[PDB]
Design an enzyme around this catalytic site. Structure first.
Site, PDB file in Angstrom:
ATOM      1  N   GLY A 161     -13.466 -37.244 -42.474  1.00 27.92           N
ATOM      2  CA  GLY A 161     -12.806 -36.932 -41.323  1.00 27.92           C
ATOM      3  C   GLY A 161     -11.379 -37.143 -41.723  1.00 27.92           C
ATOM      4  O   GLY A 161     -11.111 -37.933 -42.489  1.00 27.92           O
TER       5      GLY A 161
ATOM      6  N   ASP B  25     -13.303 -44.542 -26.531  1.00 31.01           N
ATOM      7  CA  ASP B  25     -13.649 -43.201 -27.108  1.00 31.01           C
ATOM      8  C   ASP B  25     -15.290 -42.860 -27.326  1.00 31.01           C
ATOM      9  O   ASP B  25     -15.523 -42.416 -28.363  1.00 31.01           O
ATOM     10  CB  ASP B  25     -12.860 -42.917 -28.132  1.00 31.01           C
ATOM     11  CG  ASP B  25     -12.858 -41.302 -28.373  1.00 31.01           C
ATOM     12  OD1 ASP B  25     -12.135 -40.923 -29.290  1.00 31.01           O
ATOM     13  OD2 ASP B  25     -13.267 -40.415 -27.660  1.00 31.01           O
TER      14      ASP B  25
ATOM     15  N   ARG C 229     -19.476 -37.552 -31.090  1.00 35.77           N
ATOM     16  CA  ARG C 229     -18.472 -37.601 -32.130  1.00 35.77           C
ATOM     17  C   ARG C 229     -18.114 -38.619 -32.773  1.00 35.77           C
ATOM     18  O   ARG C 229     -17.890 -38.960 -33.957  1.00 35.77           O
ATOM     19  CB  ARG C 229     -17.293 -36.859 -31.873  1.00 35.77           C
ATOM     20  CG  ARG C 229     -16.387 -37.382 -31.054  1.00 35.77           C
ATOM     21  CD  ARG C 229     -15.196 -36.650 -30.543  1.00 35.77           C
ATOM     22  NE  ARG C 229     -14.506 -37.286 -29.387  1.00 35.77           N
ATOM     23  CZ  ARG C 229     -14.701 -37.062 -28.100  1.00 35.77           C
ATOM     24  NH1 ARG C 229     -15.758 -35.992 -27.810  1.00 35.77           N
ATOM     25  NH2 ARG C 229     -13.978 -37.847 -27.318  1.00 35.77           N
ATOM     26  N   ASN C 230     -18.554 -39.980 -32.084  1.00 39.64           N
ATOM     27  CA  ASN C 230     -18.093 -41.316 -32.575  1.00 39.64           C
ATOM     28  C   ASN C 230     -19.466 -42.027 -32.829  1.00 39.64           C
ATOM     29  O   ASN C 230     -19.448 -43.143 -32.662  1.00 39.64           O
ATOM     30  CB  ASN C 230     -17.176 -41.931 -31.537  1.00 39.64           C
ATOM     31  CG  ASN C 230     -15.815 -41.613 -31.964  1.00 39.64           C
ATOM     32  OD1 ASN C 230     -15.309 -41.800 -33.288  1.00 39.64           O
ATOM     33  ND2 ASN C 230     -15.096 -41.727 -31.047  1.00 39.64           N
TER      34      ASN C 230
ATOM     35  N   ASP D  40     -15.719 -45.522 -34.645  1.00 42.61           N
ATOM     36  CA  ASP D  40     -14.380 -44.978 -34.136  1.00 42.61           C
ATOM     37  C   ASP D  40     -13.613 -44.256 -35.036  1.00 42.61           C
ATOM     38  O   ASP D  40     -12.930 -45.139 -35.752  1.00 42.61           O
ATOM     39  CB  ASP D  40     -13.952 -46.293 -33.337  1.00 42.61           C
ATOM     40  CG  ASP D  40     -12.687 -45.864 -32.516  1.00 42.61           C
ATOM     41  OD1 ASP D  40     -12.658 -44.851 -31.640  1.00 42.61           O
ATOM     42  OD2 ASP D  40     -11.643 -46.634 -32.351  1.00 42.61           O
TER      43      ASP D  40
HETATM   44  C1  LIG Z   1     -14.553 -46.352 -43.198  1.00 40.18           C
HETATM   45  C2  LIG Z   1     -14.744 -46.923 -41.803  1.00 40.18           C
HETATM   46  C3  LIG Z   1     -13.546 -47.892 -41.418  1.00 40.18           C
HETATM   47  C4  LIG Z   1     -13.714 -48.281 -40.194  1.00 40.18           C
HETATM   48  C5  LIG Z   1     -14.551 -47.864 -39.158  1.00 40.18           C
HETATM   49  N1  LIG Z   1     -14.575 -48.466 -37.812  1.00 40.18           N
HETATM   50  C6  LIG Z   1     -15.133 -48.403 -36.695  1.00 40.18           C
HETATM   51  O1  LIG Z   1     -16.278 -47.503 -37.029  1.00 40.18           O
HETATM   52  C7  LIG Z   1     -15.323 -48.984 -35.778  1.00 40.18           C
HETATM   53  C8  LIG Z   1     -16.028 -49.152 -34.605  1.00 40.18           C
HETATM   54  C9  LIG Z   1     -15.907 -49.828 -33.459  1.00 40.18           C
HETATM   55  C10 LIG Z   1     -14.683 -50.314 -33.261  1.00 40.18           C
HETATM   56  C11 LIG Z   1     -14.494 -51.241 -31.919  1.00 40.18           C
HETATM   57  N2  LIG Z   1     -13.359 -50.791 -31.255  1.00 40.18           N
HETATM   58  C12 LIG Z   1     -13.080 -51.959 -30.081  1.00 40.18           C
HETATM   59  C13 LIG Z   1     -11.843 -51.406 -29.596  1.00 40.18           C
HETATM   60  N3  LIG Z   1     -11.508 -50.105 -28.990  1.00 40.18           N
HETATM   61  C14 LIG Z   1     -10.522 -49.904 -28.252  1.00 40.18           C
HETATM   62  C15 LIG Z   1     -11.757 -49.121 -30.277  1.00 40.18           C
HETATM   63  C16 LIG Z   1     -13.304 -49.484 -30.872  1.00 40.18           C
HETATM   64  C17 LIG Z   1     -13.665 -50.524 -34.237  1.00 40.18           C
HETATM   65  C18 LIG Z   1     -13.945 -49.668 -35.367  1.00 40.18           C
HETATM   66  C19 LIG Z   1     -15.584 -47.106 -39.497  1.00 40.18           C
HETATM   67  C20 LIG Z   1     -15.590 -46.549 -40.745  1.00 40.18           C
HETATM   68  N4  LIG Z   1     -16.651 -45.768 -41.329  1.00 40.18           N
HETATM   69  C21 LIG Z   1     -16.736 -44.351 -40.669  1.00 40.18           C
HETATM   70  N5  LIG Z   1     -15.918 -43.703 -40.123  1.00 40.18           N
HETATM   71  C22 LIG Z   1     -15.816 -42.453 -40.033  1.00 40.18           C
HETATM   72  C23 LIG Z   1     -16.929 -41.770 -40.145  1.00 40.18           C
HETATM   73  C24 LIG Z   1     -17.768 -42.475 -41.220  1.00 40.18           C
HETATM   74  C25 LIG Z   1     -18.997 -41.745 -42.149  1.00 40.18           C
HETATM   75  C26 LIG Z   1     -19.167 -40.311 -41.860  1.00 40.18           C
HETATM   76  C27 LIG Z   1     -20.150 -39.640 -42.499  1.00 40.18           C
HETATM   77  C28 LIG Z   1     -20.989 -40.481 -43.101  1.00 40.18           C
HETATM   78  N6  LIG Z   1     -21.030 -41.784 -43.310  1.00 40.18           N
HETATM   79  C29 LIG Z   1     -19.995 -42.304 -42.486  1.00 40.18           C
HETATM   80  N7  LIG Z   1     -17.833 -43.638 -41.579  1.00 40.18           N
END
Ligand SMILES: Cc1ccc(NC(=O)c2ccc(CN3CCN(C)CC3)cc2)cc1Nc1nccc(-c2cccnc2)n1
Length: 297
Positions: free
Chosen positions: A32, A156, A160-161, A174
């Site tokens: 992404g 969000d 998709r998330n 996210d």
């Molecule tokens: C590499 C990474 C770095 C950071 C994150 N972070 C998050 O996933 C996340 C989830 C929830 C929150 C909580 N948050 C609270 C406050 N609000 C406003 C936003 C959300 C924050 C971050 C994910 C990832 N991983 C990620 N991200 C996108 C796609 C993929 C992915 C895609 C395909 C196969 N495997 C993994 N993997």
């Protein structure tokens, strides 16, 4: 679930225990990409086990990103650290914050993004069946209940998330900096922002407030996406002046064909104009637990 306080991530300290040698990462394909950030598949060495290669996901700033975006990525890193590692939320594994571009490392989810998964598996409806959909609804509600328990709001929530991994376990994520919201038609210009309007509660649209209850509204839309096997919400209803008026009037989506009655009932309660009448994720978890048990045998 306290709507009077929030976690300010700039006040969260970065735990140095997460720091990982960046030379032990090997970068792969793009999963992404947004304006200032991207997620890539990668291999990490001795991340969990000393002499073991493991596939991970890595979120990084592009060279063209500013301090503001680095702060945001660091904040996201601290939020994930605060949340801890759970079955139904993406798991933080490490970070590389110094000596190169700032990187955040999480688990890799072998089935990728849930929206793409649903769209790919639409025909199979191994095959996808009702209990899969119920399981996904349950796990997303479970993960969101945990987020709410940590006094965190997603903002969000949408198919998709959500990611999908081994054993058809869903992981709330996210994409944040790493989604191209400029070219995603699910994000619509409203004022000076591109917003996921079709997933948003009226109070968020009109008053710019996000709450535990507005996440529940988004979850209702997610349920619709889920049981429509990845269809875009409000079919034949583009986001314009009429859309806002209609949502305010009380227009709601009809049930997806594949949604059990009680799942549609949940959707309708999630989309109550009155945030106080919406169920909590804790409540939703119990309701879906029951449906899953009833839908077996
Ligand atoms: C590499 C990474 C770095 C950071 C994150 N972070 C998050 O996933 C996340 C989830 C929830 C929150 C909580 N948050 C609270 C406050 N609000 C406003 C936003 C959300 C924050 C971050 C994910 C990832 N991983 C990620 N991200 C996108 C796609 C993929 C992915 C895609 C395909 C196969 N495997 C993994 N993997």
């Amino acid at each position: 679930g306290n709507n009077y306080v929030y976690i300010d991530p700039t006040q969260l300290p970065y735990d140095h225990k997460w720091e990982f040698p960046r030379n032990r990462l090997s970068f792969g394909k793009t999963l992404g990409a947004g304006a200032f950030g991207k997620v890539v598949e990668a291999t990490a060495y001795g991340l969990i086990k000393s002499d073991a290669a493991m596939t991970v996901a890595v979120k990084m700033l592009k060279p063209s990103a500013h301090l503001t975006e680095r702060e945001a990525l660091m904040s996201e890193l601290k939020v994930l650290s605060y949340l801890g590692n759970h079955m139904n939320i993406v798991n933080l594994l490490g970070a590389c914050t110094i000596g190169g571009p700032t990187l955040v490392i999480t688990e890799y989810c072998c089935y990728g993004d849930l929206l793409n998964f649903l769209r790919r598996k639409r025909d199979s409806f191994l095959a996808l069946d009702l209990e899969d959909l119920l399981s996904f609804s349950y796990q997303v509600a479970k993960g969101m209940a945990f987020l709410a328990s940590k006094n965190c709001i997603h903002r969000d929530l949408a198919a998709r998330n959500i990611l999908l991994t081994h054993g058809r376990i869903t992981k709330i994520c996210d994409f944040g900096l790493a989604r191209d919201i400029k070219n995603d038609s699910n994000y619509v210009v409203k004022g000076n922002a591109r917003l996921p309007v079709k997933w948003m509660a009226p109070e968020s649209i009109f008053n710019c407030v996000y709450t535990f209850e507005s996440d529940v509204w988004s979850y209702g839309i997610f349920l619709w996406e889920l049981f429509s096997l990845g269809s875009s919400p409000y079919p034949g209803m583009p986001v314009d002046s009429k859309f806002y008026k209609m949502i305010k009037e009380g227009f709601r989506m009809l049930s997806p064909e594949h949604a059990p009655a009680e799942m549609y009932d949940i959707m309708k309660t999630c989309w109550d104009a009155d945030p106080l009448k919406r169920p909590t994720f804790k409540q939703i978890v119990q309701l879906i637990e029951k449906q899953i048990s009833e839908s077996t045998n």
